[PDB]
């Protein structure tokens, strides 16, 4: 996260860390949506151009963290994966369209003041909150600059941008399964997700029922916090039918 602040303890209890076993390193961010399901971005697991193809056995999921490099004894939980499901139409060949994946944990995690699931939005919430100008929040232990890394979880609140502007900022083809967020050069506010943050959540807080809903997944961006560019996120609600399906089928 670039130009973000340190999160508070228990601010994002659904934030997850995808860690690799060998080498031991931070792979991506992810979110806890049920006591047995984690949601992340498919390009964190599969991206053939760079020979990335991880399997259950190569990842660990760490939940309840604040510190990036420390094993927070008696606070965080480490789960193993049972299964990884990538969206059948994830487009890694062109624009990372449908960059979403679900991971089933080996065993359920118990909630605590530090571990708690995020809600997934329903058509009505999507409709009333996914409007350009409204702000969302992104969290992660990603880079602090394009070209270092933070000791704790960082947070930044960004507004959603009108789709025309998003399309007019890149050469890449935007589909209806993506949305972009960030500030315009002419706003005097900065912020963006960056490398290391992919897979984590973009959430909004409903003013009707006070719950936090995850509207997007950090997907891609060109550089980090560059002026004129924006960050793109997977549109969770448009892919929700796929989510429901694998969770009530597996």
């Amino acid at each position: 996260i670039v130009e973000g602040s340190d999160a508070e303890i228990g601010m994002s209890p659904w934030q997850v860390m995808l860690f690799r076993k060998s080498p031991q390193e931070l792979l991506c961010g992810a979110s806890l949506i049920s006591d047995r399901w984690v949601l992340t971005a498919a390009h964190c697991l599969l991206y053939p151009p760079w020979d990335k193809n991880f399997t259950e056995n190569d990842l660990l999921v760490r939940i309840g963290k604040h510190s990036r490099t420390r094993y927070e004894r008696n606070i965080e939980k480490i789960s193993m994966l049972e299964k990884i499901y990538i969206h059948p139409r994830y487009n890694w060949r062109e624009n990372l369209d449908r960059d979403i994946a679900l991971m089933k944990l080996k065993k359920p995690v118990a909630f605590s003041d530090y571990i708690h699931p995020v809600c997934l939005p329903d058509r009505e919430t999507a409709a009333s909150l996914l409007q350009a100008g409204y702000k969302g929040r992104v969290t992660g232990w990603g880079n602090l600059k394009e070209t270092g890394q933070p000791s704790v979880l960082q947070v930044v609140n960004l507004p959603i941008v009108e789709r025309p502007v998003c399309k007019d900022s890149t050469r890449i083809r935007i589909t209806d399964n993506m949305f972009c967020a960030g500030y315009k050069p002419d706003e005097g506010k900065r912020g963006d997700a960056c490398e290391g943050d992919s897979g984590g959540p973009f959430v909004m807080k409903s003013p009707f029922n006070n719950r936090w809903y995850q509207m997007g997944i950090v997907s891609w961006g060109e550089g980090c916090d560059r002026d004129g560019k924006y960050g793109f996120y997977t549109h969770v609600f448009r892919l929700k039918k796929w989510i429901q399906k694998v969770i009530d089928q597996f």
């Binding site: 860690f19 076993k21 031991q24 660990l60 490099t69 420390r70 480490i78 193993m80 890394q149």
Partner: peptide, 11 residues
């Protein structure tokens, strides 16, 4: 820079 974690989570 990551601190080690309990061997039991590698297996």
């Amino acid at each position: 820079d990551f601190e080690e974690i309990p061997e039991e989570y590698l297996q």
